[PDB]
């Protein structure tokens, strides 16, 4: 899908929550990558978002760094509780005796 | 595979022209078995596939050439004694295109489904001069029907098959030898096979109705199989030949 914008938003949000600011994702503009990289390197974090992470299951560090960061996730109205359906014999239609 | 097909473009089959319907519309036209299809393609093999002169000769033989496409000027001259239309054939362009067309062939081309022009009306004066003198037919037609001739005189066929609209010289650049073939955008396979210099034994077509009517039902089945397989391969997806054989 080539969603580099998601990575840029993650990096900007991480820099913002580190320095207490609100970065802008304005189309054809906004905060550049160099600014958020400098903000990350200033607070002592990695300039690429990837951080040293230890596996919780085995207790051993991972061979590759994990890309952590705050992302603005939104929940949709599509719920499994409202979409779950099961049909017994039940009623039928008057014209054609079908469910 | 119809859902798997993307209906792409730019698939000119290596000639960079002659846009042909391929994909789901092609499969639909094949399975509908319509008598007239969109953009029919006829592949003709040559006896002399190494010579380009023979290729252009047989191309001019099979391709329909109108009178206005070869004549350099057509003028309605009203002399004080009589009025007539003078057509000047461009012999230079004729020998450039290698068309076997002279004043006699042009005169024979006229008087054919053209308001019943009598043979005495058309005459030849020079080597490439044609004089047409129409007469009143009395069926609500007078001498000032000359203009009507000006509307359809250049649009008369002098050489080639009327059903053939466009024929091009395709070339194959195989490392062993570069051979020449004819790609005809027409709907007449029998005429193409009947022309001189065309190897009719290795002539195929895209229209299944023409193949059925000309070379039998088994040739039509084979053409359907080959065309469906080619259309399927064009999209990169493969189908077992047994399915298309059962369909045909």
């Amino acid at each position: 899908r080539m969603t580099v914008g998601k990575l840029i938003e993650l990096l900007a949000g991480k820099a913002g929550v580190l320095d207490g600011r609100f970065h802008y994702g304005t189309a054809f503009g906004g905060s550049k990558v160099k600014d958020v990289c400098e903000d990350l390197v200033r607070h002592g974090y990695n300039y690429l978002g990837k951080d040293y992470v230890t596996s919780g299951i085995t207790g051993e560090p991972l061979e590759a760094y994990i890309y952590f960061g705050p992302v603005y996730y939104q929940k949709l109205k599509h719920m499994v509780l409202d979409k779950m359906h099961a049909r017994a014999r039940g009623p039928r239609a008057v014209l054609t005796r079908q469910p | 595979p119809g859902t798997q097909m993307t209906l792409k473009t730019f698939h000119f089959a290596g000639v960079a022209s002659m846009n042909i319907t391929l994909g789901v519309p092609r499969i639909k036209e094949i399975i509908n078995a319509s008598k007239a299809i969109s953009t029919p393609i006829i592949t003709a093999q040559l006896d002399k596939d190494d010579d380009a002169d023979y290729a252009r000769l047989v191309k001019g033989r099979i391709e329909k050439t109108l009178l206005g496409e070869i004549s350099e000027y057509i003028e309605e001259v009203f002399l004080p004694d009589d009025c007539f239309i003078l057509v000047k054939l461009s012999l230079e362009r004729i020998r450039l295109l290698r068309l076997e067309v002279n004043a006699e062939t042009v005169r024979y081309s006229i008087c054919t489904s053209k308001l019943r022009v009598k043979p005495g009306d058309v005459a030849v004066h020079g080597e490439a001069v044609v004089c047409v003198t129409p007469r009143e037919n009395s069926k609500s037609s007078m001498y000032y029907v000359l203009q009507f001739l000006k509307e359809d005189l250049p649009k008369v066929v002098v050489q080639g098959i009327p059903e053939v609209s466009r024929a091009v010289i395709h070339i194959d650049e195989q490392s062993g030898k570069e051979k020449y073939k004819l790609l005809v955008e027409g709907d007449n396979l029998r005429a193409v096979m009947a022309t001189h210099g065309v190897k009719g034994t290795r002539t195929t077509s895209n229209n299944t109705y023409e193949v059925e009517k000309t070379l039998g039902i088994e040739a039509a089945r084979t053409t359907i199989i080959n065309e469906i397989q080619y259309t399927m391969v064009n999209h990169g997806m493969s189908i077992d030949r047994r399915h298309v054989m059962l369909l045909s």
Binding site: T3, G5, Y72, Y73, Q74, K75 | -
Partner: protein
């Protein structure tokens, strides 16, 4: 409700019956008043829109009118007589919500951030989508089914609409109309419209050799018949006239009024109509060569009808029906009832217009028999899934096609949508490409008076078309000037004309919404002044430097000036699609070159309302942006400050909504941060346990336990205890 309704009332101010003359009903002035509720016994009471939502009633205002009539030849005047109920759009001029403070909004149980602009009928919120249609009174050159390149013109006036076509099926031009039995040659119509000499016809068509060569067959076919005078041609047309010398009069009436209604004839003078059809034939001849076929998807030829024009047409139809019913009742009552003089006040049905408006707004189907218009899906239920959902549905635009065929032409994204409509915002599904959204910075123009435009055009040297023959139309330097499809005249050196018109519009003597464009291919200067056209503001650039400087922006920030001052001082001007087709616009200051006329204000204004929520959208793919807009239209979150008192059939709310950390300027503009529809979570992009194979995600149990993602679903259960005809009630 302030101007158009008064014009509609003035158009039907007097209504009278044929029987019993000297009797009439004269309307004086109509008022709409403030929204009220008829709950109280014969008493009106101010009602808030939220109360109308709760009580499942309509939010309308009583339309009254003052009149004068004759009962027994004694003129009786009425100063206040209610005649209907018009539903009041929220946040309008007469709405109770306008001119209110957020505290007063809280006192009325209404959200201050609510966009409004939607009607409330029977408790449901209906929104009238912006309708899109083709521009009227315009020649369209297009290919037919058999490949024949013909022309069409749909002449639509305030009364009748007629689409007449012209074809070249047999090398000659035949004119086809719905009022003719068989298509007739164009030369016969030329001879019937006053001009009888064939030389003048040929000069009007064109003096080019190919033009005469193409028009030859038509002249020959005309000379074949014995049609050489106006009387013979009119007799032939009348013989070809369908049933609805008498035939000659009917043919002349159809040629003068029915055919080309938009082209006006002073007194049976078809000179303008002759020039119009000659220009049409010339365009067809020029299009018969190089395939310069006009496209339907070009938005410069599109018109947007808002709710105002639709409501005006509906009110006009309802008022005409009411007047017809009143005249019928008068004719039935007055001549035989009694010496008791009949008066209209005893039969002024007040529920007719009210029920008509209520049904047309609720059901959404509009059937106008006076205009033969049968539309469906005009009004839609406002989606209250979230604030973004309603804010985006409020600026929706539907297509005229309405899924009649998968053409893929109008469904495609045309370059004409630049700055006008959002390119990425479109519903994913069967309605992809037919339902669109407006841009962030856009405006729809209204109708003008068109008087000073004609005056300035006449004073700018435009010679009258009646003064010269059609031969001047064939000159390469003579350019035709039009006006809303009507031939305004001819001109030479159109550059000076266009420059002077633009300078006069910038000065303020001409309305800033009047558009002017030039087509060098057809050599036509179009002057558009009708409503529904899309315009966009642009900074004027003169000699490689924009007119707007840092000092002007500092004054704007400090409050010395506003946008209207920028409009008046020739700094920012509105450009139409047809006008921007000829102008040169620069995206940025560094892109400004010598051949630049305007400057783009802001590029991110290209996106719409929903697409503005996308952080860094220029780094993502277009289907991703489309899916994001589609899901944001269905995103869960807070609706407004009055979401607790609001009782809807289905509502989704978030427990702990949080504003995004990466917010676009559009978010601050639409105040989305005050009503967020999501939460910021510490996401780690990695593969874990293989439970996120295809698009899935793994959630933390402790996070969900501590309140992350907690949601609330509010449903409504309504019951009614109504009294029947008999004296019994539900208990």
């Amino acid at each position: 409700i302030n101007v158009e309704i008064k014009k509609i009332m003035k158009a039907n101010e007097k209504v009278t019956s044929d029987a019993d003359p000297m009797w009439y009903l004269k309307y004086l002035n109509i008022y709409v008043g403030l929204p009220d509720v008829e709950e109280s016994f014969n008493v009106t009471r101010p009602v808030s829109p939220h109360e109308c939502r709760l009580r499942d009633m309509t939010y309308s205002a009583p339309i009254t009118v003052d009149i004068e009539y004759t009962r027994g030849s004694q003129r009786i005047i009425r100063n206040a007589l209610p005649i209907g109920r018009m539903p009041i759009m929220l946040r309008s001029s007469n709405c109770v919500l306008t001119g209110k403070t957020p505290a007063e909004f809280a006192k009325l149980n209404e959200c201050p951030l609510d966009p409004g602009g939607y009607f409330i009928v029977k408790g449901v919120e209906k929104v009238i989508l912006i309708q899109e249609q083709l521009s009227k009174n315009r020649i369209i050159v297009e290919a037919d089914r058999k490949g024949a390149v013909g022309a069409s013109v749909t002449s639509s006036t305030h009364e009748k609409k007629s689409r007449t076509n012209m074809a070249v099926k047999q090398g000659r031009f035949y004119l086809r109309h719905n009022t003719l039995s068989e298509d007739i040659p164009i030369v016969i119509i030329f001879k019937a419209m006053g001009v009888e000499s064939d030389q003048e016809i040929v000069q009007m068509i064109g003096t080019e050799e190919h033009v005469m060569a193409a028009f030859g067959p038509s002249l020959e076919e005309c000379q074949k018949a014995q049609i050489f005078t106006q009387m013979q041609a009119l007799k032939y047309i009348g013989n070809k006239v369908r049933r609805q010398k008498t035939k000659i009069e009917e043919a002349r009436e159809l040629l003068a009024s029915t055919i080309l209604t938009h082209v006006p004839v002073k007194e049976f003078n078809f000179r303008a109509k002759c020039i119009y059809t000659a220009v049409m034939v010339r365009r067809v001849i020029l299009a018969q060569g190089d395939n310069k076929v006009d496209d339907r998807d070009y938005y410069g030829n599109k018109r947007l009808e808002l709710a105002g024009q639709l409501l005006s047409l509906l009110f006009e139809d309802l008022f005409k029906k009411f007047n017809s019913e009143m005249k019928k009742i008068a004719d039935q009552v007055i001549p035989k009832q009694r010496a008791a003089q009949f008066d209209v006040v005893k039969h002024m049905r007040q529920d007719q217009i009210t029920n008509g408006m209520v049904n047309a707004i609720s059901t959404g189907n509009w059937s106008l028999k006076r205009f033969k218009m049968d539309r469906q899906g005009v009004t839609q239920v406002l989606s209250r899934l979230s604030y973004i959902s309603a804010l985006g549905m409020m600026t929706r635009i539907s297509s005229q096609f309405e899924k009649t065929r998968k053409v893929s032409g109008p469904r495609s994204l045309q370059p004409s949508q630049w700055g006008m409509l959002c390119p990425s915002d479109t519903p994913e599904g069967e309605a992809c490409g037919l339902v669109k959204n407006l841009a962030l910075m856009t405006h729809i123009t209204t109708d003008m008076e068109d008087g000073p435009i004609v005056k300035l055009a006449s004073n700018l040297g435009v010679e009258d078309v009646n003064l010269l023959c059609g031969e001047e139309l064939s000159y390469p330097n003579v350019f035709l000037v039009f006006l809303n499809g009507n031939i305004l005249g001819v001109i030479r050196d159109h550059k000076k004309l266009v420059n002077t018109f633009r300078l006069m519009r910038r000065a303020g003597y001409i309305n800033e919404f009047v558009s002017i464009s030039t087509n060098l291919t057809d050599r036509c200067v179009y002057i558009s002044s009708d409503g529904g056209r899309l315009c966009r503001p642009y900074i004027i650039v003169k000699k490689q430097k924009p007119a707007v400087t840092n000092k002007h922006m500092e004054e704007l920030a400090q409050g010395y000036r506003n946008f209207e001052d920028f409009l008046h001082e020739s700094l920012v001007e509105y450009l139409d699609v047809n006008e921007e087709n000829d102008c040169n616009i620069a995206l940025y200051e560094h892109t400004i070159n010598k051949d630049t006329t305007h400057l783009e204000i802001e590029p991110f204004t290209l996106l719409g309302v929903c697409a503005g929520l996308i952080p860094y959208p220029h780094h993502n793919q277009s289907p991703r942006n489309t899916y994001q807009c589609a899901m944001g239209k269905q995103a869960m979150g807070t609706i407004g400050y009055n979401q607790r008192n609001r009782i809807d059939t289905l509502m989704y709310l978030l427990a702990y909504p949080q504003k995004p950390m990466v917010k676009t300027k559009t978010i601050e503009l639409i105040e989305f941060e005050k009503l967020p529809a999501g939460q910021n979570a510490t996401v780690a992009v990695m593969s874990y346990s293989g439970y996120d194979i295809e698009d899935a995600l793994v959630l933390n149990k402790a996070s969900l336990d501590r309140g992350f993602g907690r949601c609330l679903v509010y449903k409504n259960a309504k019951c009614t205890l109504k009294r029947y005809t008999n004296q019994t009630f539900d208990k």
